[PDB]
Each structure stands twice: as structure tokens, then as C-alpha cells.
Design an enzyme around this catalytic site. Structure first.
Site, PDB file in Angstrom:
ATOM      1  N   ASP A  34      -3.033   4.779  14.788  1.00  0.00           N
ATOM      2  CA  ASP A  34      -2.135   5.924  14.718  1.00  0.00           C
ATOM      3  C   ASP A  34      -0.666   5.467  14.637  1.00  0.00           C
ATOM      4  OD1 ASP A  34      -1.369   8.555  14.591  1.00  0.00           O
ATOM      5  OD2 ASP A  34      -1.233   8.819  16.749  1.00  0.00           O
ATOM      6  N   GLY A  54       8.836  15.826  25.804  1.00  0.00           N
ATOM      7  CA  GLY A  54       8.275  16.274  24.549  1.00  0.00           C
ATOM      8  C   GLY A  54       6.779  16.240  24.615  1.00  0.00           C
ATOM      9  N   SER A  55       6.163  17.070  23.792  1.00  0.00           N
ATOM     10  CA  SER A  55       4.712  17.189  23.763  1.00  0.00           C
ATOM     11  C   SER A  55       4.186  16.828  22.382  1.00  0.00           C
ATOM     12  CB  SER A  55       4.252  18.597  24.165  1.00  0.00           C
ATOM     13  OG  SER A  55       4.909  19.054  25.331  1.00  0.00           O
ATOM     14  N   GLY A  56       3.075  16.087  22.363  1.00  0.00           N
ATOM     15  CA  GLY A  56       2.364  15.720  21.153  1.00  0.00           C
ATOM     16  C   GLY A  56       0.909  16.120  21.285  1.00  0.00           C
ATOM     17  N   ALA A  57       0.036  15.733  20.345  1.00  0.00           N
ATOM     18  CA  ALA A  57      -1.372  16.118  20.458  1.00  0.00           C
ATOM     19  C   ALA A  57      -2.097  15.372  21.577  1.00  0.00           C
ATOM     20  CB  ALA A  57      -2.099  15.882  19.140  1.00  0.00           C
ATOM     21  N   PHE A  58      -1.643  14.162  21.941  1.00  0.00           N
ATOM     22  CA  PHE A  58      -2.294  13.385  22.999  1.00  0.00           C
ATOM     23  C   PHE A  58      -1.764  13.693  24.398  1.00  0.00           C
ATOM     24  CE2 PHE A  58      -4.693  10.459  20.357  1.00  0.00           C
ATOM     25  CZ  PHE A  58      -4.059  10.593  19.137  1.00  0.00           C
ATOM     26  N   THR A  82       1.870  15.166  27.004  1.00  0.00           N
ATOM     27  CA  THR A  82       3.281  15.440  27.230  1.00  0.00           C
ATOM     28  C   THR A  82       3.929  14.264  27.963  1.00  0.00           C
ATOM     29  OG1 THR A  82       3.047  17.834  27.165  1.00  0.00           O
ATOM     30  CG2 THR A  82       4.833  16.983  28.521  1.00  0.00           C
ATOM     31  N   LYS A 134       3.388   9.674  30.810  1.00  0.00           N
ATOM     32  CA  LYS A 134       2.658  10.451  29.824  1.00  0.00           C
ATOM     33  C   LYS A 134       1.366  10.947  30.453  1.00  0.00           C
ATOM     34  CE  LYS A 134       1.355  10.691  25.108  1.00  0.00           C
ATOM     35  NZ  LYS A 134       1.733  10.103  23.783  1.00  0.00           N
ATOM     36  N   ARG A 165       6.638   8.803  14.414  1.00  0.00           N
ATOM     37  CA  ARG A 165       6.687   9.411  15.733  1.00  0.00           C
ATOM     38  C   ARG A 165       6.293   8.402  16.820  1.00  0.00           C
ATOM     39  NH1 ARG A 165       0.710  10.621  14.825  1.00  0.00           N
ATOM     40  NH2 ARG A 165       1.108  11.745  12.868  1.00  0.00           N
ATOM     41  N   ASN A 166       5.481   7.396  16.473  1.00  0.00           N
ATOM     42  CA  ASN A 166       4.961   6.423  17.422  1.00  0.00           C
ATOM     43  C   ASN A 166       5.773   5.139  17.432  1.00  0.00           C
ATOM     44  OD1 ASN A 166       2.903   8.003  18.422  1.00  0.00           O
ATOM     45  ND2 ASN A 166       1.479   7.417  16.789  1.00  0.00           N
ATOM     46  N   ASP A 226       2.113   3.998  21.966  1.00  0.00           N
ATOM     47  CA  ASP A 226       0.843   4.720  21.988  1.00  0.00           C
ATOM     48  C   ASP A 226      -0.341   3.887  21.521  1.00  0.00           C
ATOM     49  OD1 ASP A 226       1.939   6.871  23.147  1.00  0.00           O
ATOM     50  OD2 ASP A 226       1.786   8.217  21.435  1.00  0.00           O
TER      51      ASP A 226
END
Ligand SMILES: OCCCc1nc(-c2ccc(F)cc2)c(-c2ccnc3[nH]c(-c4ccccc4)cc23)[nH]1
Ligand SMILES: OCCCc1nc(-c2ccc(F)cc2)c(-c2ccnc3[nH]c(-c4ccccc4)cc23)[nH]1
Ligand SMILES: [Cl-]
Ligand SMILES: [Cl-]
Lengths: 294, 308
Positions: free
Chosen positions: B137, B19-23, B25, B45, B141-142, B155
């Protein structure tokens, strides 16, 4: 009680065979918890012949005992599934069994590993002894490698459920007498297996003729890498008088002492160039695949 | 120091996109120990472009901090690969993140799990606060699911590591989690334990709404205005007023009046003992926690670590 989970065929699947034999087949498998979408690797051992409902209850009773062994150097039975073939489920040890490990890494296994494996194996056996359990089938093939630094005795109860003649105390060959000190006998064969990097014991001898060579004073040869100090300890594990054999608590102490000056007790070419994992590499192993306390 | 293993590209491989996030993949990868044969599953990551580069040492300087977190409810960074990209290695969690989990199990998650997940998250954050660290953050999701019974915060430190400025403070997809951020943090880039408690608030609200999008339909760039005017996330339908009031206290403008994580622990632990008094979930009586058999099984298979 709540230590043994009764599974259902529907919630797990065998992926690939890992090993065979006769008593059972070993598979890598995937556990699929119901309602979830994750597939969890397991080790599955499926046994040979089918059993009646009343045999199943004798097996299930013993499974519970197997499920209660709680020690970082003995494998715990996690679960069971019963139909005509019965399936044992436990954690998947990806490195496999320690016999194969030493044969594949034959010469390039250092002395710290070998002596530390001797400590761990004795610690596990001594745990069974403290709980008055008797294994009956200790051998290098029945030790599993979790990580190279962490080995576990496996197959407790399987030998007691249902012949390894060349590992058995003399009293057990002639009289089917199994004790803690007969376990000490096989422990010594196991050590001998490790120190020779998996040589086969009494290579060149019929299994039928082992009891007589034992009665005539023959024992397994000193391994080339073993000093006399280590060989005498093996030789003490094989004495005729079971009660004169060392006890596992003593073997842990003795090998632990030796693990502290490893190159004094085993002579291995290139040992100085084979070191033990740093604090770094060993935290990494533990954080990844070996979180249990020791 | 020795908590952080430094890998080279030779000794691990990415095999699947998770999966990919803003920070960046997340890939499922394989670590191949030297001289061994086995392939050990791992999580990798690869981080995106970092605003204001800090060489490698300053990166390792923060990595070591991330490697130091030792708590059953915070993911520790295990190792790192510094090359053409920055690659983080941690333990693989096959269940993935709690935001995806509550969505796919929406209306089939009883009150016991929801309240226990909040206790564990607050224990995670309480530990960070105790270590004088700010996450910056926290969000559904985290939070990763190690097992359904055991979640961990992940994260930690990536927000301070990558930073990410520019228009991402106005966009709705970037590195800046506007709709989780405390008003002080949106306005003055200020991050404390008490702004972390604001994100805890929103995190819990995502849990209690089974994965809803917060302030949905309002542009991120407009959030700081509506907050200044008293708007807050509304009461999730399964929440008694007790719970919603805790959520709303987390979101007070005066950081000093927000609750402290240690109090969150006790209050959500108290509700966990009488879970149906605090969440009204239809069919809750027929959603139960796992049996000891089941948990013992999960623990021995997947989750051998300490943990309360
Ligand atoms: O060795 C004793 C008899 C054979 C065996 N029986 C078992 C056994 C399994 C489940 C159970 F409930 C009780 C016993 C195993 C075994 C157990 C756990 N992990 C494991 N990995 C490999 C493995 C990994 C890579 C290459 C080759 C083998 C085996 C194994 N092997
Ligand atoms: O904000 C982003 C949160 C994303 C994330 N980031 C990470 C992450 C990885 C390495 C690291 F060093 C630091 C953080 C993960 C993650 C970590 C471990 N196991 C994992 N499985 C799945 C997973 C499994 C099945 C289906 C979908 C996802 C993710 C993950 N997820
Ligand atoms: Cl067999
Ligand atoms: Cl991300």
C-alpha cells in the site's frame, strides 16, 4: 558558519517561562518555519541587558564557537536572534536540569544512573578539553536531562560571555585563573551535588568565607551513599595543586570501571529494586526523542 | 524482540485527532514514562476492525516485523497497546503526509525537492525489498514528511495485518487501494516487490501532479478493465518524457519488465543533479533547496537520525 542560524522575532514565539535567574530568562518556545504551518518546540534563553551593535558582534562571534560544540554530552547552540535583548535558541530538553531531577527523584535514583551520569558529564568536559575550551561554570544546574539515561552539559560560553563561589577552584577565587583543571574542581562539586541528591554545597557558610576554609583544608563532607573509593576521587578533584587533580580522561575511565560494579561503590537503600532501563525501554526512548549517535 | 514496546492504556493518552483513513484514525498523544512527570508527544494509530481476526500473538508477530524496519526512509513501529482495540505508537511527524504537503504547497515546490522525494521513497522501498518485505500500500498518503528535506514511508504491514476483503475491492474508499494496485494484485491478490514498483509509479505521478487524484472519474471497480486495455495515467504537465517513461515502465503488465528499485534510485539520483533538465516548473529558478544553515537547523532540532 552554517552551524548557527540567525533567526527573526517573526519566526518564533515564547510560550511559557521555564526558569529565571539574572543573566537571562528561559522559555519554552515554538519555531514556525516560514511558508509552513508547523510549530516546533524550542528552548529559548533571553539575556538580561540590551547590547549595542558592537557588543552584539562580540556576542555573535562567541555564539559561533558555542554553535560548533558537537558532542552527545554537551548542548549545541542552534540559533540566535538579536535586538535589544538577545535570544539564544536550542533544542528543548523536556526533563529539565539534573539538579532538579535528583532533588525530585531524591531516593529512587539508582546507583547505575548516578555513576553513568558521572561518566557522561566527564565525557562532555573532556570533549571541551580536547578542543581547548574551558567551561568556567560546571554545576548540577548546568547539566540538562535529555532522557534519564542521557545528560548534557549546557551553558558553555554563557559564563564566558556575560559568581558561583562554592563551585570554583581555589585558584579561581583568589586569582580569577580558569583552566581545564579548575573545571575538574567544579566537576567534583557537581558529582558531590548528585551523590547528595542536590544538597547545597557549603550549606551554613557565607560565600565570602569559602576561600579561607579551603585554605585551612576544609572540603565538602563525604556523602552518606558514597564509599571511600568515590569520595577519594572527589577529594582528589579539590587539591590545591591544580596539576595534581585528575584529568577528565581518567575520571571517565575510573567512573566507568565503577559503573560496572555499581553497588560496590555506592550504598543506596533499595538499590536492588531500582534497575536500569531494559533494551526495550531504551530503544523506545531513543526512537522517540533521542536519535543522536553516541 | 526488544524493538517493540508493549504499552498499557495507563501510560499514554490520545489528545487530538490528526486524521482518519480506511485503516484507522491517527491521534497526537502523550507518553508518560513511569515515575516521571514529563509528557512526551507521540503519534497513536487506532486500527479499525480487522477482517479474519488473528488473536493477539499473530498480531504481535507482525508488529515485531514492523518494529524491525531500520532505515532512514521507512517509519519503524515503536510500540503497541493490545486491548479492546489495537493501538500503534510511532514518532510524531508534525508536518504530516506528503500528499497533503504537495497539495498545500502546489506551485511552490521546485524540481529539486520532487526528484529528491522520489530517490528517498525508492531507497525506502529498496530497503524493504532487500529485507524480503512487501509493503502492499505505497501511496503519497503513506509517505510522511519528517522534514521537507526528509520523507519516510509509513504504514508498512498494515495491509497484510488488517487485510480487508468483501466489496472493498469494488468501493473507492476502503482498505484496498485499487487505483494504486498492480493488475496482478487486483486480479489475484498477488503482492510482490514488483507490484510495489507499480504503486511507486503511481506515487510518483501523484507527486508530479501536485496531489491529483489518479484515474479521477473512473470507478475503482472498472480500473482492472481499463488497465487490461492499455489505459495508463497521463503525462503530468511538468514531466519531460524521460520521467514519464520511467512512470510508464513501472506500469507494464509483465511484472518482470518493470524497473527494480535499485535502478530507480540511480536514475532519479542522476536527474536530481540536473533537476531542471527533467522537470519543467515555471519559476523553478527561484525555488531552491535549503541552505546548509537551514538544514543543520532542521537536523539538530527535529531530525537527528542517520540518513544519507
Ligand atoms: O540551566 C542553565 C540556565 C537555565 C537554562 N538555560 C537554558 C538555555 C536555553 C536555550 C539556549 F540557547 C542556551 C541555554 C536552559 C535549557 C536549555 C535547553 N532545554 C531546557 N529545558 C529546560 C527546562 C524544562 C522543564 C522545567 C524547567 C527547565 C531548561 C532548558 N536552561
Ligand atoms: O495511511 C495513513 C497515513 C496516515 C498516518 N498514519 C500514521 C501512523 C501513526 C502511528 C503508527 F504507529 C503508524 C502510522 C501517521 C502519522 C505518524 C506519525 N506522525 C504523524 N503526524 C501526522 C499529522 C500531523 C499534522 C497534521 C495531519 C497529520 C500523521 C502522522 N499518519
Ligand atoms: Cl541566571
Ligand atoms: Cl489509514
Amino acid at each position: 558558519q552554517a552551524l548557527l542560524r540567525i533567526l527573526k522575532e517573526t519566526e518564533f514565539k515564547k510560550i511559557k517561562v521555564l526558569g529565571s535567574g539574572a543573566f537571562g530568562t528561559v522559555y519554552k518556545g515554538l519555531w514556525i518555519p516560514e511558508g509552513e504551518k508547523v510549530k516546533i518546540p524550542v528552548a529559548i534563553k533571553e539575556l538580561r541587558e540590551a547590547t549595542s551593535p558592537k557588543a552584539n558582534k562580540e556576542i555573535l562571534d562567541e555564539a559561533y564557537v558555542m554553535a560548533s560544540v558537537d558532542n552527545p554530552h554537551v548542548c549545541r547552540l542552534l540559533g540566535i536572534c538579536l535586538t535589544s535583548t538577545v535570544q539564544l535558541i536550542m533544542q528543548l530538553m523536556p526533563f529539565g536540569c539534573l539538579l532538579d531531577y535528583v532533588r525530585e527523584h531524591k531516593d529512587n535514583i539508582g546507583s547505575q544512573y548516578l555513576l553513568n551520569w558521572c561518566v557522561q558529564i566527564a565525557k562532555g568536559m573532556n570533549y571541551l578539553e580536547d578542543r581547548r575550551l574551558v567551561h568556567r561554570d560546571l554545576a548540577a544546574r548546568n547539566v540538562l536531562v535529555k532522557t534519564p539515561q542521557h545528560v548534557k552539559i549546557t551553558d558553555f560560553g554563557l559564563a564566558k560571555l556575560l559568581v558561583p563561589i562554592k563551585w570554583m577552584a581555589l585558584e579561581s577565587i583568589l586569582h580569577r585563573i580558569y583552566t581545564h583543571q579548575s573545571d575538574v574542581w567544579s566537576y567534583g562539586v557537581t558529582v558531590w551535588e548528585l551523590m547528595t541528591f542536590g544538597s547545597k554545597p557549603y550549606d551554613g557558610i557565607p560565600a565570602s568565607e569559602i576561600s579561607s576554609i579551603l585554605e585551612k583544608g576544609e572540603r565538602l563532607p563525604q556523602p552518606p551513599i558514597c564509599t571511600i573509593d568515590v569520595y577519594m576521587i572527589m577529594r582528589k578533584c579539590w587539591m590545591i595543586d591544580a596539576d595534581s587533580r585528575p584529568k577528565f580522561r581518567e575520571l571517565i575511565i575510573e567512573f566507568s570501571k565503577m559503573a560496572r560494579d555499581p553497588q560496590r561503590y555506592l550504598v543506596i537503600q533499595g538499590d536492588e529494586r531500582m534497575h536500569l532501563p531494559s533494551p526495550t525501554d531504551s530503544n523506545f526512548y531513543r526512537a522517540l526523542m533521542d536519535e543522536e549517535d553516541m
